[PDB]
Design a protein around this ligand. Structure first.
Ligand SMILES: O=C(Cn1ccc2c(=O)[nH]c(NCc3ccccc3F)nc21)Nc1ccncc1Cl
Ligand SMILES: O=C(Cn1ccc2c(=O)[nH]c(NCc3ccccc3F)nc21)Nc1ccncc1Cl
Ligand SMILES: [Cl-]
Ligand SMILES: [Cl-]
Lengths: 122, 122
């Protein structure tokens, strides 16, 4: 019987993206080939099975830098990071395979399923 | 023209609450009278003008403990912290004044407005 605020979760996410844009309380750098991306571990964990698995382990929880597999496309990663923080996925003809393969690696199954739909629709 | 995931922001928040429940990557303790509450600064900042104002200041950004005003009701605070992480506000007859006053102090204006509505409805 609690009162539901229907825009609250979305508003929080938007504010978290604003903090990311200002580098406030970011606690990890993700290195992908020649590029680097700063983020909040908590958001990464909430959105990715790979990052969840990494940072839940006490051995790896305080890591400040994560080097991704060198074969991962930085653009694919950037699209998915933007999705994590915005709920909006920038899927396009020229990026679909890179985004799909990166989502598989990051263990983002709902996103992988959505890419299967984009392929199907052409 | 991006693809909108309508449950993503909500799912993230839920996962963040799960991390809080497990004390994973919490980075602050909020002390309110005799009680203490652990949280993620980023979520606090996203949800409260008081916490935003505190942690944006470089002088205060690395604080690991925040002592709230001793007059603040811990139950009022707990209700609002639960709201921050769930989007669901536990407003009741026996708690409305405490929650409203705590929301004013925490600078949560939409919540204060909602409390004005509960009072009106009785
Ligand atoms: O669920 C997530 C992360 N996540 C987001 C999407 C997504 C996915 O598609 N596959 C996986 N596989 C790994 C896995 C992790 C957890 C439970 C089952 C499971 F199979 N994980 C994903 N994080 C989370 C869960 C619970 N409590 C707190 C947090 Cl932060
Ligand atoms: O907006 C918030 C926090 N917040 C949530 C509810 C709420 C409120 O009712 N009143 C206030 N007053 C202070 C204030 C802060 C910022 C802008 C205007 C402003 F008046 N702040 C609130 N945080 C945020 C904003 C932007 N970028 C990143 C983050 Cl994390
Ligand atoms: Cl910082
Ligand atoms: Cl931790």
């Amino acid at each position: 019987s609690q009162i539901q605020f229907t825009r609250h979760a979305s508003d929080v996410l938007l504010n978290l993206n604003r903090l990311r844009s200002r580098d406030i309380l970011t606690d990890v750098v993700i290195v992908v080939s020649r590029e680097q991306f700063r983020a909040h571990k908590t958001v990464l964990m909430a959105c990715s099975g790979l990052f969840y698995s990494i940072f839940t382990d006490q051995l790896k929880r305080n890591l400040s830098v994560i080097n991704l597999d060198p074969e991962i496309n930085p653009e694919g990663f950037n699209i998915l990071l933007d999705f994590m923080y915005t709920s909006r996925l920038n899927l396009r003809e020229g990026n679909i395979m890179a985004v799909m393969a990166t989502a598989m690696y990051l263990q983002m199954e709902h996103v992988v399923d959505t890419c299967r739909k984009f392929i199907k629709a052409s």
